Every structure is written in structure tokens, then in C-alpha cells.
Amino acid sequence: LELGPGGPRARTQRLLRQVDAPVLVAYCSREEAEVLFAEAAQAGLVGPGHVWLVPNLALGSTDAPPAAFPVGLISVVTESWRLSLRQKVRDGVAILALGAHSYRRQYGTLPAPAGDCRSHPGPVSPAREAFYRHLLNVTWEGRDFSFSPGGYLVRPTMVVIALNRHRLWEMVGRWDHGVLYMKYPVWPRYSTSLQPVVDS
Amino acid sequence: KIVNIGAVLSTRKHEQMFREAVNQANKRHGSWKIQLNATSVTHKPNAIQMALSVCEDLISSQVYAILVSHPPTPNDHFTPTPVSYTAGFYRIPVLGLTTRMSIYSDKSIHLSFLRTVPPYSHQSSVWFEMMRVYNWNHIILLVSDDHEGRAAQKRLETLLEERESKAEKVLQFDPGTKNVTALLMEARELEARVIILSASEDDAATVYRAAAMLNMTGSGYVWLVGEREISGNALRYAPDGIIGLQLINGKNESAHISDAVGVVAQAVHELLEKENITDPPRGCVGNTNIWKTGPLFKRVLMSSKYADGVTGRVEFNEDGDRKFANYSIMNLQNRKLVQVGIYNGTHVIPNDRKIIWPGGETEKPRGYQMSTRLKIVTIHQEPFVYVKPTMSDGTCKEEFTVNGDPVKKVICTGPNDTSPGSPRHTVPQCCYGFCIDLLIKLARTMNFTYEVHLVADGKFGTQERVNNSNKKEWNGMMGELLSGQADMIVAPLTINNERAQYIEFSKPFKYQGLTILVKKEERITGINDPRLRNPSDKFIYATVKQSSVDIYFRRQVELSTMYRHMEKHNYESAAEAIQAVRDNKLHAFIWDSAVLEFEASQKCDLVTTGELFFRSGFGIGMRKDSPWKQNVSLSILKSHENGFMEDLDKTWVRYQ
Ligand SMILES: *[C@@H]1O[C@H](CO)[C@@H](O[C@@H]2O[C@H](CO)[C@@H](O)[C@H](O)[C@H]2NC(C)=O)[C@H](O)[C@H]1NC(C)=O
Ligand SMILES: *[C@@H]1O[C@H](CO)[C@@H](O)[C@H](O)[C@H]1NC(C)=O
Ligand SMILES: *[C@@H]1O[C@H](CO)[C@@H](O)[C@H](O)[C@H]1NC(C)=O
Ligand SMILES: *[C@@H]1O[C@H](CO)[C@@H](O)[C@H](O)[C@H]1NC(C)=O
Ligand SMILES: *[C@@H]1O[C@H](CO)[C@@H](O)[C@H](O)[C@H]1NC(C)=O
Ligand SMILES: *[C@@H]1O[C@H](CO)[C@@H](O)[C@H](O)[C@H]1NC(C)=O
């Protein structure tokens, strides 16, 4: 889809009429998410018999779900999504501190801090990738924070959240690295406003 | 209205020429309603300082467009990157005219960056055309470990794969490192003779040096690289008679600037006829949101096809790249590149200087070299593969059969009874028997020389996930064949779907099935006994793990419960399970027919049961690509009508 400002609805809505799936997965931005939610609202594919999925990118504030967001949408995020910013900062500082302390345990020295902006060191300062390696494996409060070679967190513990019947975002389940848990072995398909329907 | 157009240059001459080009655009279209003005900045060695200069100079004015070129010094090839991020913060379009790196080609990080010249990765496209020129297939890929190398690899593999073709193999190397010859070693003996490569100039020089000292410049061998790999020290180390790729407009930065100004003028004039035009933010500080027409400008600049290019009609691709590229192919004859072809947007026309290939010839050599010396992998199986230690002379004591003929014994190297308790020292013992007999028969039939050795791990192999549930791959002989360690599978192997999904089989040279062995009423009734129909703990039954019957029990979902028993008692070889049954440790052993009735007729202390419920064939399985498939098929069929394996059965399995 185009989904940009002033995008031709006929080109989009026509193909939506050509869309016949009851279960969907979508990818877009949060503004594009709002636009497509409105577009499906006039398309009628928002109905209870319809399922649509989306990654974290098209989501804004979990505490601020816009009215365009339809009820029953579900995604998965980090467990720290309910932790306040202070807790996140403390955990990050703890990760850095434990990495530095592991560097000291292996060698007994503080990690060399970086320089200023009017120059740029060429070599990688082998102590620095030693610190990086000791930072590649982080565990705190039982939650591992070992990162990936791709520069991000690898093998994390995720929580699956779903918008509730009161337009509230709440967690339905948890993916613990090999195991799935989730409430509601059936999904309440509210009658486009409320009152989930019993499947025949 | 005045619109500012920005440039990033360090020449002090192309700056004034860019101003003159802005004036020329004004002459071509007119700036009475919408005045046009130019602005030039100088890229600096310090990335932070030049980014600050861009922020406080080019953003301090509501500049609608910006372009960049490379500095003469090869230091900081990614100089435009801070400019790209600065434009991205407000999502501003940016043009790079001189970059050849696919890093900038990414639009997930560089949203509105456009590049006139395609990167070195797009160079890949011409090699595909080269493949069409010479009707070649035996492609060997060599590439650096850098992101540019991986991107080029992906592009070229896509290009070769839409034609249902696949690269024979791919090799990756760490840039700047040495001792690459060893890597070249494991690529040296492959049957292919045409080569492709992707690296940097110093890496190109290193590999040129290695190939020269490895005699890789001989006949048949040939390869092709980009401009940077045939320049400077790389050109110095390059051999003569090597082919090379050249840009039509590699070094004329002025032409790039002219065409860029023209296309920018076209795009901006198409913009000004529209409404809701938002001025770009003035100054980084005080503005922290998106620019609205920025994405609009990129949308109308994808659609901008600039015909008045000095280098011709400039049409951007889906990703802002000039389509239908203009290249040339030279030949490095006597330390100079000489014209051998011109690449127009989709094909090549040769003109003169007939290609003098590195082997010293002027006629096109086939990019292939069939090997008479072939690799053979096997697994120990006494009725079909007899393995015995050799004595001091390097061989083992040969003996003559009852008929008086000697048994033909080949030198097979095995890691001293491969096991954790084995030192893994691969001693050359002697192998002989049925399979060896038929190998030597078909070999002298096809005259091809052979190298025989059993499998390293001693296991058949199955499609299994890589360690921590990563992608599926083959173990055992299928592993060595999908990797190329051997050429055919010479063993009483069981044909099946998944092997056929990756390997192929000839017509089966033997017909066989499955049955059970026990010791010495209590007759286990074949397969339909609730003793086995219903899994029972008191009764023990298993097979060899990573084998065909494993796949049998896996596909038979209703039998999965018995498969659950498999997980407890699966063996690794036949002999130890045979001893366990003779020791009554194992109640019953399911396995293939032929071996099993052979053992029953020989030892007579154990009894077989159950019919050959799974009809199957022992056939020569090997790679889909190689031509020996039909040849070996017809040869073994001719032996069948000749009853040669009947004589072999009389020699080995019958009369017991
Ligand atoms: C570099 O490119 C510029 C174009 O920007 C060339 O200048 C013109 O090139 C055309 C092509 O033959 C000539 O017909 C014009 O007479 C040239 N004009 C001027 C003012 O020179 C320039 O010749 C190119 N130079 C090199 C070395 O490639
Ligand atoms: C982290 O990994 C490094 C090796 O890269 C190892 O030396 C160190 O002991 C590890 N520490 C932890 C807590 O795993
Ligand atoms: C190169 O020289 C000859 C000719 O091929 C060959 O015998 C020799 O082994 C080769 N040496 C290397 C290092 O490849
Ligand atoms: C590419 O080649 C064509 C054919 O020779 C020639 O017109 C010019 O060099 C290039 N064309 C364009 C449109 O760039
Ligand atoms: C591009 O050049 C080729 C030959 O190099 C020639 O077929 C034609 O001029 C162009 N290709 C096509 C498909 O038109
Ligand atoms: C010998 O082998 C070569 C290549 O393997 C083949 O071309 C030739 O026909 C063979 N000759 C005989 C008599 O088998």
C-alpha cells in the first residue's frame, strides 16, 4: 500500500475489496497504521471475524492508544514495557557497570573512555573490544541481556499484549525463549463495539 | 521566491562551475517567478566538524536540495554519510554523484539518498551478461566479508537464479588478511574454469599475487573484477591478458555535476507547479519535526526522468539508480587496458582486440574442466564393505578366493575406528567386497580414475537443525556431497523422498527391504504384533540413529510412539547391536533385508523375521548436475542383463 498523505483511496480500497482474508498481518508506520485503520473502517474489514497483526514499529505510546486503533489488536514487546523510565535507566547503568566490573575481573583495569570530537582514533583499542565481549553476555535480576553480533539484543524474553475490550492495552501472554503462555484460549470477537459473539 | 540549491565540493573550480550550472538552468527555464540561488560547502576531514558545518550553514538557510562528490584522497570513503544523516533528520533529499558503495544504496537507513552512478554491486549485472556472451555455467564466486561483498553476492546470486541457474560454490574471505591460498586450495581442484571475484584494491593485489604464484593464470582459468581491483597496486599485480570493466564516465565529476543540476532543475520546476509547498526548516536548533514536501520531492524525483543529461537520458531506477547503464570492457594486454567491448544498457557489442586469455590463447576456452580423478565416499558394512587393517607394507595380506581369483583391495583411509576413543588418525586400511567390486567394474568401464575412502563420522546422516534450532542441513555422506567432499555415494543406501529432494539416484542396482533379527513360540509376528504395534517397556527394539528408517518412523506419524522408543535405544553401527542381540541386551533389531539375511545365513545363531514390508532399492546416488547419471544407470543396467551382480552375489552373499 501507499498510505501516504493524499493516497488514492480507489486504488487502495479496490484492492481491499479484493482482500478476502479473515486473518492478516500488516507492516507500516504508526501514522500509516492510523490511516489504514480508518481505511479498513470504511472498508468493513475491521469486523470481529477479521484478524490483523502488526509489529512494534506501527505503535506509538502504549499508554496513548489513538481512537483509530481498533479493538482486539495484538502484538509483542519487551517485558520492560510497564517499567518506568527510571527503572530502564537503572537497568542500563547496571548493565554497563557489570560489564566494566567483568573487565576488571579479567584484567583489573577500568575501561578506557573515549576521546573528543576534533580527532578520531584509527585502531580499535583491543581493550575496547574486550569490554565489548564482556558486554556481549549480561544477566541482571534473572533477565539476561546478552546482545547479538548485529548490535542488538538476542534471545530476549517477550510479552504478548493485546488491546482489551475497554480500549486498554494489557498483556495476554509471554514467550519465554522456548515456551508460550497466553490467556483466552478463544478470542472474544466483540460485536464491533462490545459483547463478544459465540462462534457457531 | 528564491530556492537554494546546495553542493558539497572541495575543488574551488567545480564550485564556480556549479554556480554557472545554476545560471544555465535559470537560462533554460527562467527564474522570474521563482528565483534560484546556489550554495557550496567544503567537506572536511573531521566528520563531526563537517557535520556541524552542514548543520549550521546549509540548514541555517532554507536550502531545498543538496549534492555531494567524493574527495580525491581515498580516506573516509563514507564522507557523505554525516550529510545523509543530517538530511534524514528532517527527511531531506540528498544526491551523491561519485559513490560506488552499496552502503548508501540502503533506504532503511538512508531514506532520501539518490545516487547517479550505480554502486560496484550493480556491476554484478554485466557478469550475468558475460555469462550470456560465452554460454558458461561453471561459476565460482569469491568475495570479501565486507557488507559491500555480501550485497554484491546477493545481487549476483539473484541474477543467476532467475535463470534457474545456481553458483557452483561461493567463498568468503576476510579483507586485508593473507594466506588466502589455502582457501584457493579448496577451490583449486573444482571442475569449473571461469571465475568471478569481488574485493578491494589491496585484496585484489593479494589474490593476484597468490594466483600468480599458484599458476592460476594458465589456460582455461579466467576472471573479471571492477575498476578498483584493476587500479594502482592491484593493476601492478594483475596478470596480463586479464579482462576488466570500465565506466563510461568514471572520473569526469564535472559531467556528473552538470547532469545533477539539470535533473534537480527539472524536479524543482515540477515541484513549483504544485501547491502546499513547505519551506525546509531554517536552522537545526528550533526545528525538530519532519519536512513535508521532502518525501513529496523524493516521490516526484523517482518519477523524474532527466532527458537533457550530457551523458544521455538519465532515468532513475526504483531505488534512484540510473538504469540501462553505460559500461565498457577492456583487456589488460601488456600492462594496458585495451577495448574489447562496449556495454550498452542490457548487452555488449565487441569491436576489436580479440580476447587474449591468460593461458596464452586468443580463442574462447570453455569455462569448465572435467576431472577424470573422482572422489569416493563409503561407510563400513561387512556384507557390502569389508574393512581390514593393513600390515607394515602399507597394504594387507591379499588372498585368493575359493575359485582362486584374488580379492581386489583398495586403500581406504579411516580415522582408526572413528569414535571419541579413537585418536582420529586416519590410517589407510584396506577395503574390499561387493561395492568395491562394482566400483572397479564400472570404473574400468568408464576408464575414470578414482580415490576411495569411507565417511569420516561413520553415520548416514539426516536433515537436522543446526545446533540451536538453526537452519536444516545434511549429515554424513549427504553432507559431504552437498559440500563437495565426494562425488557419488557407493553403499547399500536406502532411496527416499528427502534424499531425492536434494540428491538423485540411478536405477537401483539391488532390490531389498526391511526385517527384524532376534535370537533363536514367542515368534514376533513381523510388524503387526501388538508387542510392536503397542510400544512396550519390557521389550527393547531400535535401529541406527540418523538413518533412513528414522525418516520412515518419522513420516509414519501413527508409529511415532514406537519412534519415541527409538529415542532411547538407537545404536550407531550394526556390529554392536548384533552383539547386543546375541547378548540378548536388545530384544529385536529392525534393519534392511539384504545385510540381515546375509548375517543370518552366515552366523545361524540369530533368526530373522518379518517380510520385506518396505520394498526399496540399493542404487548409486549422487549429484543432480554431473553427467555420469545416465552413463552409470545404463552401465549398471547392462551389468544386470549380464548378471554381473548375480556373479557378485554368488561370490559374496550366496554359498553360505
Ligand atoms: C568532462 O565533462 C564535461 C561536461 O560537463 C566536458 O565538457 C564538454 O564535453 C563535451 C563532450 O565532448 C564537448 O562537446 C564540449 O565541448 C565540452 N565543453 C567544454 C566547455 O569543455 C569535458 O570535455 C569532459 N572532460 C573530460 C576530460 O572528460
Ligand atoms: C562473557 O564472555 C567472555 C568471553 O567473550 C568470558 O570470558 C566471560 O567470562 C563471560 N562472562 C559471563 C558472565 O558470561
Ligand atoms: C606452480 O608451478 C608448477 C606448475 O603448475 C606446479 O608444479 C607447482 O606445484 C605450482 N606451485 C604452486 C605454489 O602452486
Ligand atoms: C549508453 O549507450 C548508448 C548507446 O551507445 C549511448 O546513446 C550513450 O552512450 C548511453 N545512453 C544513455 C541514454 O545514457
Ligand atoms: C543495448 O546494447 C545491445 C548490445 O550491446 C543492443 O542489443 C541494443 O543496442 C541494446 N539492448 C537492447 C535490448 O535494446
Ligand atoms: C580412457 O579414459 C578416457 C578419459 O577418462 C576416455 O576418453 C577414453 O575413452 C578411455 N578409453 C578406454 C579404452 O576406456
Short mmCIF file of N, CA, C and O in Angstrom, two decimals, chain B residues 95-156:
data_model
loop_
_atom_site.label_atom_id
_atom_site.label_comp_id
_atom_site.label_asym_id
_atom_site.label_seq_id
_atom_site.Cartn_x
_atom_site.Cartn_y
_atom_site.Cartn_z
N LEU B 95 21.78 14.00 -2.81
CA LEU B 95 22.32 13.38 -4.01
C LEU B 95 23.81 13.10 -3.81
O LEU B 95 24.56 13.97 -3.36
N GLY B 96 24.23 11.87 -4.11
CA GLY B 96 25.64 11.54 -4.16
C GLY B 96 26.01 11.09 -5.57
O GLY B 96 25.42 10.15 -6.10
N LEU B 97 26.99 11.77 -6.16
CA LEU B 97 27.30 11.56 -7.57
C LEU B 97 28.46 10.60 -7.80
O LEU B 97 28.55 10.02 -8.89
N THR B 98 29.33 10.41 -6.81
CA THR B 98 30.59 9.71 -7.03
C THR B 98 30.71 8.42 -6.22
O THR B 98 31.72 7.72 -6.34
N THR B 99 29.71 8.09 -5.41
CA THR B 99 29.81 6.92 -4.54
C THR B 99 29.55 5.63 -5.31
O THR B 99 28.67 5.56 -6.17
N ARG B 100 30.34 4.60 -5.00
CA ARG B 100 30.16 3.27 -5.55
C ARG B 100 29.91 2.22 -4.48
O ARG B 100 30.09 1.02 -4.74
N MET B 101 29.49 2.63 -3.29
CA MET B 101 29.30 1.73 -2.16
C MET B 101 27.82 1.44 -1.97
O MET B 101 27.01 2.37 -1.88
N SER B 102 27.47 0.16 -1.87
CA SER B 102 26.09 -0.24 -1.64
C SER B 102 25.59 0.15 -0.26
O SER B 102 24.38 0.05 -0.01
N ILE B 103 26.48 0.57 0.64
CA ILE B 103 26.06 1.05 1.95
C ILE B 103 25.07 2.20 1.80
O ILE B 103 24.01 2.20 2.43
N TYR B 104 25.41 3.18 0.97
CA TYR B 104 24.48 4.27 0.68
C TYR B 104 23.25 3.80 -0.08
O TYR B 104 22.24 4.50 -0.07
N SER B 105 23.32 2.64 -0.74
CA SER B 105 22.19 2.15 -1.51
C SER B 105 21.03 1.71 -0.64
O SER B 105 19.91 1.54 -1.15
N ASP B 106 21.25 1.52 0.66
CA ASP B 106 20.19 1.11 1.57
C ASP B 106 19.25 2.29 1.80
O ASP B 106 19.70 3.42 2.00
N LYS B 107 17.95 2.02 1.76
CA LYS B 107 16.94 3.04 2.04
C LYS B 107 16.29 2.87 3.40
O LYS B 107 15.45 3.70 3.77
N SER B 108 16.66 1.84 4.16
CA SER B 108 16.18 1.74 5.53
C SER B 108 16.91 2.72 6.44
O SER B 108 16.34 3.19 7.43
N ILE B 109 18.16 3.03 6.12
CA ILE B 109 18.96 3.97 6.88
C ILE B 109 19.11 5.29 6.15
O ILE B 109 19.19 6.35 6.77
N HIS B 110 19.13 5.25 4.82
CA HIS B 110 19.32 6.45 4.01
C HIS B 110 18.07 6.61 3.15
O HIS B 110 17.98 6.14 2.02
N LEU B 111 17.08 7.30 3.73
CA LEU B 111 15.74 7.29 3.15
C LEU B 111 15.71 7.96 1.79
O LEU B 111 15.23 7.38 0.81
N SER B 112 16.22 9.18 1.70
CA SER B 112 16.03 10.03 0.53
C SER B 112 17.34 10.26 -0.21
O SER B 112 17.48 11.24 -0.94
N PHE B 113 18.32 9.39 -0.01
CA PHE B 113 19.57 9.48 -0.74
C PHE B 113 19.41 8.88 -2.14
O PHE B 113 18.85 7.79 -2.30
N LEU B 114 19.90 9.61 -3.14
CA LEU B 114 19.87 9.17 -4.52
C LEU B 114 21.28 9.23 -5.07
O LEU B 114 22.04 10.14 -4.75
N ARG B 115 21.63 8.24 -5.89
CA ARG B 115 22.97 8.14 -6.46
C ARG B 115 22.89 7.95 -7.96
O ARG B 115 22.21 7.04 -8.45
N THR B 116 23.58 8.83 -8.70
CA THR B 116 23.54 8.77 -10.15
C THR B 116 24.20 7.50 -10.68
O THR B 116 23.61 6.77 -11.48
N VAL B 117 25.41 7.21 -10.22
CA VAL B 117 26.18 6.05 -10.67
C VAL B 117 25.80 4.87 -9.79
O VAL B 117 25.79 5.00 -8.56
N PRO B 118 25.45 3.73 -10.36
CA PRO B 118 25.19 2.53 -9.55
C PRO B 118 26.45 2.09 -8.83
O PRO B 118 27.57 2.30 -9.32
N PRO B 119 26.31 1.47 -7.66
CA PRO B 119 27.49 1.02 -6.91
C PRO B 119 28.22 -0.12 -7.60
O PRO B 119 27.77 -0.63 -8.64
N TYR B 120 29.36 -0.53 -7.03
CA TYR B 120 30.08 -1.68 -7.57
C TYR B 120 29.22 -2.94 -7.57
O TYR B 120 29.42 -3.82 -8.42
N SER B 121 28.27 -3.04 -6.64
CA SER B 121 27.41 -4.21 -6.58
C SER B 121 26.59 -4.36 -7.86
O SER B 121 26.45 -5.47 -8.39
N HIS B 122 26.05 -3.26 -8.37
CA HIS B 122 25.33 -3.32 -9.63
C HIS B 122 26.23 -3.75 -10.78
O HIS B 122 25.73 -4.25 -11.79
N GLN B 123 27.55 -3.58 -10.62
CA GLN B 123 28.49 -4.13 -11.58
C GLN B 123 28.18 -5.59 -11.87
O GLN B 123 28.32 -6.05 -13.01
N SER B 124 27.75 -6.33 -10.84
CA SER B 124 27.35 -7.73 -10.99
C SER B 124 26.57 -7.98 -12.28
O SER B 124 26.80 -8.98 -12.96
N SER B 125 25.66 -7.06 -12.63
CA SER B 125 24.77 -7.27 -13.76
C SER B 125 25.53 -7.62 -15.03
O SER B 125 25.08 -8.46 -15.82
N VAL B 126 26.69 -6.99 -15.26
CA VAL B 126 27.40 -7.25 -16.51
C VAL B 126 27.95 -8.66 -16.54
O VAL B 126 27.97 -9.30 -17.60
N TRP B 127 28.41 -9.19 -15.40
CA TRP B 127 28.89 -10.57 -15.37
C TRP B 127 27.83 -11.54 -15.87
O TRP B 127 28.12 -12.44 -16.66
N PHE B 128 26.59 -11.35 -15.43
CA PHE B 128 25.49 -12.15 -15.96
C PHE B 128 25.44 -12.06 -17.48
O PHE B 128 25.36 -13.08 -18.17
N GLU B 129 25.54 -10.84 -18.01
CA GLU B 129 25.61 -10.67 -19.46
C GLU B 129 26.82 -11.41 -20.02
O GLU B 129 26.73 -12.09 -21.05
N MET B 130 27.97 -11.30 -19.34
CA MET B 130 29.14 -12.08 -19.73
C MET B 130 28.79 -13.55 -19.83
O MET B 130 29.18 -14.23 -20.79
N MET B 131 28.04 -14.06 -18.85
CA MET B 131 27.63 -15.46 -18.89
C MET B 131 26.81 -15.75 -20.14
O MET B 131 26.99 -16.80 -20.76
N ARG B 132 25.92 -14.84 -20.51
CA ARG B 132 25.16 -15.00 -21.75
C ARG B 132 26.07 -14.92 -22.97
O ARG B 132 25.78 -15.56 -23.99
N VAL B 133 27.15 -14.15 -22.90
CA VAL B 133 28.03 -13.99 -24.05
C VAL B 133 28.71 -15.30 -24.40
O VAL B 133 28.77 -15.69 -25.58
N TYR B 134 29.22 -16.01 -23.40
CA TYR B 134 30.06 -17.18 -23.63
C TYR B 134 29.36 -18.49 -23.32
O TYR B 134 30.00 -19.54 -23.35
N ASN B 135 28.06 -18.44 -23.01
CA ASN B 135 27.26 -19.64 -22.74
C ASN B 135 27.87 -20.49 -21.62
O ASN B 135 27.89 -21.72 -21.70
N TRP B 136 28.38 -19.84 -20.58
CA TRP B 136 29.05 -20.54 -19.49
C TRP B 136 28.07 -20.83 -18.36
O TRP B 136 27.04 -20.17 -18.22
N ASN B 137 28.41 -21.84 -17.56
CA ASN B 137 27.62 -22.18 -16.39
C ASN B 137 28.45 -22.40 -15.13
O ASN B 137 27.92 -22.21 -14.03
N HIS B 138 29.72 -22.79 -15.25
CA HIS B 138 30.50 -23.28 -14.13
C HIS B 138 31.13 -22.10 -13.40
O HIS B 138 32.32 -21.82 -13.50
N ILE B 139 30.30 -21.41 -12.63
CA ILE B 139 30.66 -20.15 -11.98
C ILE B 139 31.14 -20.44 -10.57
O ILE B 139 30.48 -21.16 -9.81
N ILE B 140 32.29 -19.87 -10.21
CA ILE B 140 32.81 -19.92 -8.85
C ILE B 140 32.89 -18.51 -8.31
O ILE B 140 33.53 -17.64 -8.91
N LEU B 141 32.25 -18.27 -7.17
CA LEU B 141 32.20 -16.95 -6.56
C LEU B 141 33.25 -16.83 -5.48
O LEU B 141 33.36 -17.71 -4.61
N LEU B 142 34.03 -15.76 -5.52
CA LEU B 142 34.94 -15.38 -4.45
C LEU B 142 34.62 -13.95 -4.04
O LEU B 142 34.50 -13.08 -4.91
N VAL B 143 34.46 -13.71 -2.74
CA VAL B 143 34.00 -12.42 -2.28
C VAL B 143 34.55 -12.13 -0.89
O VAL B 143 34.83 -13.04 -0.10
N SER B 144 34.73 -10.84 -0.60
CA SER B 144 35.16 -10.41 0.72
C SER B 144 34.03 -10.52 1.73
O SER B 144 32.86 -10.71 1.37
N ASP B 145 34.38 -10.39 3.00
CA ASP B 145 33.43 -10.48 4.09
C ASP B 145 32.75 -9.15 4.40
O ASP B 145 31.90 -9.09 5.30
N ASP B 146 33.10 -8.09 3.68
CA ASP B 146 32.51 -6.78 3.92
C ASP B 146 31.04 -6.77 3.48
O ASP B 146 30.58 -7.62 2.72
N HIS B 147 30.31 -5.77 3.98
CA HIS B 147 28.90 -5.64 3.62
C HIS B 147 28.73 -5.44 2.12
O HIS B 147 27.78 -5.96 1.52
N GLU B 148 29.63 -4.67 1.50
CA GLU B 148 29.57 -4.49 0.06
C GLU B 148 29.70 -5.83 -0.65
O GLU B 148 28.99 -6.11 -1.63
N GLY B 149 30.60 -6.69 -0.17
CA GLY B 149 30.75 -8.00 -0.76
C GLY B 149 29.50 -8.84 -0.63
O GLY B 149 29.08 -9.50 -1.58
N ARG B 150 28.88 -8.83 0.55
CA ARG B 150 27.65 -9.60 0.74
C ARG B 150 26.52 -9.07 -0.13
O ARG B 150 25.74 -9.86 -0.68
N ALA B 151 26.41 -7.75 -0.26
CA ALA B 151 25.38 -7.18 -1.12
C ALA B 151 25.59 -7.57 -2.57
O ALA B 151 24.64 -7.94 -3.28
N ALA B 152 26.84 -7.49 -3.04
CA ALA B 152 27.14 -7.92 -4.40
C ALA B 152 26.83 -9.40 -4.58
O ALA B 152 26.29 -9.81 -5.61
N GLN B 153 27.16 -10.21 -3.57
CA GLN B 153 26.85 -11.63 -3.60
C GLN B 153 25.36 -11.87 -3.76
O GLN B 153 24.93 -12.68 -4.58
N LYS B 154 24.55 -11.16 -2.96
CA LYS B 154 23.11 -11.33 -3.04
C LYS B 154 22.58 -10.91 -4.41
O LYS B 154 21.76 -11.62 -5.01
N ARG B 155 23.06 -9.78 -4.92
CA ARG B 155 22.59 -9.31 -6.22
C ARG B 155 22.93 -10.32 -7.32
O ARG B 155 22.07 -10.68 -8.13
N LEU B 156 24.17 -10.80 -7.33
CA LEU B 156 24.58 -11.71 -8.40
C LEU B 156 23.92 -13.07 -8.26
O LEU B 156 23.60 -13.70 -9.27
#
